[model samples]
Target: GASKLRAVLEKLKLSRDDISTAAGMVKGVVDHLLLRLKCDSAFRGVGLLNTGSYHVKISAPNEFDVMFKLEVPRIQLEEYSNTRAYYFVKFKNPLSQFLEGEILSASKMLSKFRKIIKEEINDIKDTDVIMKRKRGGSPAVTLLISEKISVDITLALESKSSWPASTQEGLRIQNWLSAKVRKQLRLKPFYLVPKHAKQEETWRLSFSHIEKEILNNHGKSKTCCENKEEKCCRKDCLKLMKYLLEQLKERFKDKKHLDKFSSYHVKTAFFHVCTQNPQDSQWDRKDLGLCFDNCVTYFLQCLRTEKLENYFIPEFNLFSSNLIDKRSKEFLTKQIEYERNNEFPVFDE
Candidate 1:
């Protein structure tokens, strides 16, 4: 019964005040970073987006993802069609002079931004938020605020170029939202994430803003949330799927491959599932347990086949080409099957 799932989820839910306070606290940190960029430096982009799961209300109380769009004027960004998540940047005249000879070196720009933001965060007398540098070329340099929550601050280059042709088969949100809204979304500027390929500097395309929009307006009708008559479990199921995946990772701590799987992957699969079955009744809040099971089944199927395509960019497969091999998929399938057969012992335990 979903009543069972609902009970455990109620326990996992964070208070609205907790999220409100975290948002206010991190706003100051990000504000100072955006202000610092206005000076005479190579980095020059206005504040673009402050979004992610936290803003979407499905994220845990302690986690946040916010990104600022960096300006790289007249920069012609090209996506590497050969690979899923790789791109090359070519700057036009005048702006090429601004990068100081390393025009398309996205790596260098990220380093400078990281150093400046780190110092700015340390200077904050109001809070002791520590910046934790992730591995080289990670999209965001995180600020672990007060040792309680982690806010990922990313500097993305805004690209007005036409989206990659390979992604033509993507962003099929007509059923969930509508074709008109989708057109308006595509009109917005796309982003180039500061991530690199194995042996070379590479920039990946990011549709995070579009993702936020879809998640925020996930229902088919205007009264999706407003109607007191019916409720949907879409957000609830996503959160539970995230929780289940995290537990699986912890259970198989010895498997490094499992670590590669994250809530984003789960979320992407959820998008695909929603589009494939876009009925509001399919996600009724009362049917939370069944929808969650269906989502898990779909995700498990994706793992087995190693083909979880990005909902916004179908060219990019969320699953690693080879990381999710036979053994890993089998392990996850068996574990999930066990939980399903036993009434989700993971949540109960």
Candidate 2:
């Protein structure tokens, strides 16, 4: 049973040659974009912040998420009333073409970035990359390299100093990672992405860097997952859950309801489950199937209750009624249950 599960997990990652070749193409495209932007006064200060699944190397085939970090100085967040997680960026010393009245417009910033990305991608030679059209209030400027390879460039604002109060309940990893370690991480900067809810003025908090760090350093013992002699299944379990969701989404793409559910949700569930099972022994690499089942069980529970709190901002409910309707939620829960009960037949294909 464990070998069968292990065999399935083996198919999740891109082949070494495929990853290297795709990495070359992706690097070429991103480098060209950034090189041009460096000359553009509007985005001269922009730095490429590499944070996402690609960095962790457990992503879907050739998919990449890149953040262009732009530091907003002396900015304060004006929390949207009743909506605890969303905030409008208020700049004390206002600047940039992306500003509107007192707050920075996420829509305006993304619009400009999208235009530049479109023009820049067209200039590259011998490349067939196509910049996808903006969809709804989606913040990502997507570029399709091929049917399999794609890139998502998101503009993130750098915020330094103390974290928001809503984040107090999050990073509950004292048992897994020491409280001292948590404090040190909290001291590091947080990011704000241009993801709007009801209005484009709002920017959602992002902790991609933090999430990446935790996933990398995940261990009760220092050598956990690092020491080949004593491996752990933390990342393997996450990869399995992510692939499961991706398959489900592909199967239900025409339904249009799975838009709210994403790989990030899988990552969130995986993080919570890790805290719940703090010991490395619980995630022994040899017991990959069992650990993956534990993650799936936790994910199913979240879907059943329709409540997966954002790992960074605890007050933000990713599955709130406004975000996901009953039909979509119940449909997803049923499909996941079906997959689990059938031993994930989706993985074979």
Candidate 3:
């Protein structure tokens, strides 16, 4: 049975050679876009911050999330008391074009950034790339390359400003990643993403940059996953869980409620599990099947309870009823149960 699980995981992974080729092409695209952005006076210092699944390479290499970080040297943040997740940023200087009176407007910056992406993507020579139509309330400006790959480009404001008070209890990695590491990560620049809200201006906290760091350097030992003798199945287990979720979504594509569930949920639960089991020895490479089961069962509990808190911001519940109602929760719960009880036949095809 474990061998069967291993076979399925192997099938789900993208080949290293193919990943190399895909990464090279994506790098070229990002470089070209950066060149174009630098030409504009307002975007002179725009830099790249690569984040998301492709960097983890847990599944297919077809999707990427790249952040075009524009540095805002000095600013003030006002957190919305009602929803601690939203913020109103006030820039001290008019160093860039994104300003509406005294506040740095999210809509103004995002709209301008979207226009540039659309224009530059169309101007690429001999390429089959196309800019996807914008979705309402969505943050990404996505590009479809040859209809085979998607690159989600997000505009982020990089500030060395301190994090909000609400996030004080978040990132409970002290036991797993050490207190010193946590302090260092907190010292790094935190990013603000343009998220849609009812009000005229809103920016949401983003830890995509930090998430990538934790994923890559994850382990109790320095050689935990790198050394052949100390190999652990931590990331592989996450990949399996991600693959299972993807299969279920594909199988029940018509079920509108299933759309509410996402890989972000799976990833949050995986991090919780990691913190619960901090020892590297617990995730032995030979026991990948058991580890993967642990991840699935943890996720099921979160779904059943309808509370998957955002890892970086505990106040923001990812499974809140506003996003996923009661009926859909039950439907997803039963679907996952069916898969677990039947050995995930969904992964077969």
Candidate 4:
């Protein structure tokens, strides 16, 4: 029993210094999720992993599907950018040992997780070119294609610190990465979702017009355990879970649950409050942070354990026997390999 504690401590030791770093990486993923939704409101309509391969898929008027995935690496880079002029630092393996209880490695694996977000950013260039042609044809016609871009960012330990210090460090890293992305993309006033501010809160949920509509239509009300405040908690931590199950059940009822094609999309909030204490149980607590963790973990488990065909569905169908489209099939096959190889060490078993 004592040895088990030791093993857990050892694993936690690797993460003790980089709590903030981990939080920052999670925030980055969440921010990108929001960006996808903002660009295409239809993305909010689909369930998670159902949005398909790209962070974005446009099917109708102002409707699109988007997804964000994260992977953490075991290395750190200093002053990283498109330019390769950077320094490297080695990280000790957090989960090299084992214990009786479930153990998670603090390998910062989420840092290396590449996010292949697909969303349709406003393509004003095409419209601009067409307008110029209509006016006088004096300006060269420029076609604007929505920036269907993928960003691979890695989070690594900048330095060692205690709990509070690490939280601050995570915020700093988030700022650094967000700034870098903005600068590189030349975005006009880039934005990111802020991290949770307190231990009780782990995610930032900003409701959009469509999200509001969904909630209003199929929302449930509940009372706060601590405050007894009656309100719609569905908007915050429970929306995705409720929506996914509801959609799945509806599809199943219609006998149209196309295991191969049906899917869901979810925009996760930030994780500053959720993963601050590497040793803490994220899914057990009832506060905002813990609640968020519970929601995500439970949702994921439902997908995996329940055999939900589209849960964490690979960007491309890797198990398909017949090739659908040559180019698309090739792309998905590569993506399947990439997904298989870039597995992160799941700390919360």
Candidate 5:
């Protein structure tokens, strides 16, 4: 018993003097409290001995200082886990608030959100989707969706080094996980995936109905360089470029020493043109030819008369050359005739 008591005292790093001092103070406090409360019992005795000597020790009262050390990192991790779950439940529903008129109960709001989340999970599980390729063999379908939300799904495939032996496999793993969670909570499924492309490789699988409206209303169509019919009309392009050049001149007015017209100025001008006047017909070819001829003539006039050497002459030349090479000289000549009602053999030759 004494040996066991000594072992415990050693483990706790408590000295005999420390134990005696603690026991004395506890006994004195208990006696004072008993007297103050007018109790019949008295503070008979106090002892500081090991637990092993429990039966052998001749004492009525005792005190032991039990100190515990915990792993702080593990405690913090558990706290974070609890906080994440709370946030997840709070923002799950995208439309529940709007659906419930003026005032709704907290329980009802949570229930609706849960139901929506479950619906989305189920829709993803029930679908088989594939990404299609663009006309030029580029990856056309950049996004995969389930329940109108972009799901982070990883694809497994043999390394490219395997070449002919390589194969790719993709599945609705995230959907399945979400489904399991929904089933556990007994919530209704309401998930749907909407495919969308952002950048060249950046794709999104999920979009709210509101988001779809915004995208459809504002999204720009990609241009096909090979198809003139699909490209923006020439007049629109020239107008866009002129607008950009004017903007650039204004922006660099204070820094006139810096040459403002560059590749960026031309590209931005072109992009604005494409966005403003998106063409969807072959009739745009004539507009395109006329726009090119007028732009080239304007640039040459500026060079010869305006003394604006800093203007984008090189870019204008490239644009002219591209149009001349891509379209027949006769077609350009015909466009000049239509626009001016005059012989234009120089453009034709």
Candidate 6:
């Protein structure tokens, strides 16, 4: 049974040499677009940010997602809802106040960013890259590479300020990462993505920069997962859970409700797990397989309870009743049970 597990894990493990060659080519395309966008005065004053799963290396190297954050150094964001993470930002400065009303408009901003990309893509006629806007309200400006992999470039808008009071329940990372680092992360602002919930106008909160920082330096010691001396299976378990969730989604292809969950849910579950178990010994590199099992157990608990809270924005439930229902949870619970008892039969093809 472990042989089957090992086989699947081996297949999922990214080959650095094989992926880097592909990574460079994909990165080249992103860099070229960044060069063209830097010229536009409409995008002036505020700097662009590069944030993505590709940078973190938790995802498949070939499947990259890059977020370009619009940094508004001086601005005030008004909350669209108290219980939700939705917001509308305004330019407080004197010179740029004219466009304040339409600042939060997705159609206006997305159209501008998309057109800029389209203009740049038109200049180079050689490459076979296909660029297209996904259905309306979708946040990403997508580029299909060789029609094999997709590189998503989403336009993220954010500013720096104190974290919301609603987020007090979550982000209890003081036990593991230290109270000092916790304060620093809380002090940083959250991003408001130009994404509509279902059909209504909405701007979702994003703490990508915070999540990246916590994951990268996750451990009791400073040099965790660095140098050869100290190591843990923290990231490894997360990768396994992510892979597991992917398979579950596919196995029940006809079940549309499963689509509500994503790698973000799994990532959030991992954060909760860390908060519960603060010791590195609990996730020892030597106990990778066992640690992975324990992580899966936590993952199962979250799904079954339908109470997956966002690690930073605790007010917003990751598994809201609207997002996921009782039927889906049963489906997920059954699938994960099969894998846990049957040495992950889901990985077989």
Clashing pairs in 3: none
Per-model TM-score versus the true fold: 0.89, 0.91, 0.92, 0.21, 0.16, 0.89
Q: Model 3, 280-340: lDDT tens per residue?
A: 8889999887888888888889889998888888888888887688888888899998888
> Cα RMSD to native, each candidate?
2.7, 2.3, 2.2, 25.0, 35.3, 2.8
Tens digit per residue, CA lDDT, model 1, 19-53: 77787777767777778766635665456473565
N/CA/C clash count, model 2: 0
What value does the lDDT take at residue 241 in candidate 4? 35
In model 5, the runs with Cα more than 4 Å from the true position are: 1-258, 293-349
Off by over 4 Å in 3: 52-61, 93-96, 136-138
lDDT score, residue 86, model 3?
78
Return the top candidate by TM-score: 3
For residues 255-279, write the lDDT of model 2, one tens digit per residue: 6768778888899999999999999
Give the per-residue Cα lDDT of candidate 3 at 317: 83
Clashes of 4: 24
Model 4 lDDT vs. the true structure?
0.27
User: What ordering of candidates by TM-score runs from best to worst?
Assistant: 3, 2, 1, 6, 4, 5
Runs in model 1 lying further than 4 Å from the true structure: 14-16, 53-61, 93-103, 124-126, 254-257, 322-326
Clashing pairs in 1: none
> Model 6 off-target regions past 4 Å?
1-7, 45-61, 93-103, 136-138, 227-229, 254-257
Q: What RMSD does model 3 have?
A: 2.2
Report the lDDT tens digits of candidate 4 across residue range 257-321. 32232223233211221222222223222343345444445334323332222111112122233
Clashes of each: 0, 0, 0, 24, 18, 0
